[PDB]
Amino acid sequence: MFYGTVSSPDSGVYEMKIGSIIFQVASGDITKEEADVIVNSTSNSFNLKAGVSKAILECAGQNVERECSQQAQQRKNDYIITGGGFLRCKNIIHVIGGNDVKSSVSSVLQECEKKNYSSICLPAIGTGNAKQHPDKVAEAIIDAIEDFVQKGSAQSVKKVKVVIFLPQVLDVFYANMKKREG
Numbered sequence: 052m053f054y055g056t057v058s059s060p061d062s063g064v065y066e067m068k069i070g071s072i073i074f075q076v077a078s079g080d081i082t083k084e085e086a087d088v089i090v091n092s093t094s095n096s097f098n099l100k101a102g103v104s105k106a107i108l109e110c111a112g113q114n115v116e117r118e119c120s121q122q123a124q125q126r127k128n129d130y131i132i133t134g135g136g137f138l139r140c141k142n143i144i145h146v147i148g149g150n151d152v153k154s155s156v157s158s159v160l161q162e163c164e165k166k167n168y169s170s171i172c173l174p175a176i177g178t179g180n181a182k183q184h185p186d187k188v189a190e191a192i193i194d195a196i197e198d199f200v201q202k203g204s205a206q207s208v209k210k211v212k213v214v215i216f217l218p219q220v221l222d223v224f225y226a227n228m229k230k231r232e233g
């Protein structure tokens with residue numbers, strides 16, 4: 052039904068269409084990317100600084116750190132939205148690494164439509180301190196995008212890119228894409 056063909060447009064980058072959306076994967080430092088939204092994978096307190104969350108909070112800066120802890124105290128949040136600080140994005144969406152990854156990605160997609168955003172960059176959510184298994188994480192991320200497309204919800208969102216710190220986790224995402232391709 053929805054899946055196009057897997058190819059490599061640039062060195063180390065792999066992509067396929069899912070309906071109208073270009074889905075891409077690559078290995079690297081997510082804090083060097085430009086996108087409307089960058090996703091952080093963090094703790095239920097939104098103040099973790101290990102792995103991806105270390106890089107994101109250090110580069111984003113202290114105002115973003117402060118924003119996170121202020122929203123954390125205000126209410127019980129499944130995720131929070133902050134400014135981009137000194138990252139190259141309009142907003143950071145901080146999701147809980149231990150939560151259901153499909154649900155987290157669905158929420159990111161819906162929040163990006165609400166802002167008329169076109170591009171998203173996320174890590175392999177949950178594979179860091181939360182210690183979720185890489186193939187379950189890959190299956191969940193791609194399933195969330197498929198569901199969003201199937202329901203006719205894609206309008207402003209055009210590009211979803213996963214930038215993955217460990218090259219061995221990239222392998223797992225590529226194999227999952229190949230399983231689905233048309």
Ligand SMILES: COc1cc(N2CCOCC2)ccc1N
Binds near residue numbers: 103104178179
């Ligand atoms: C940016 O996210 C990560 C970082 C690291 N490491 C930091 C550098 O030294 C040790 C590995 C390992 C896994 C992830 N996801």
Ligand SMILES: [Cl-]
Binds near residue numbers: 176182
């Ligand atoms: Cl994590």
Ligand SMILES: [Cl-]
Binds near residue numbers: 214
């Ligand atoms: Cl990663």
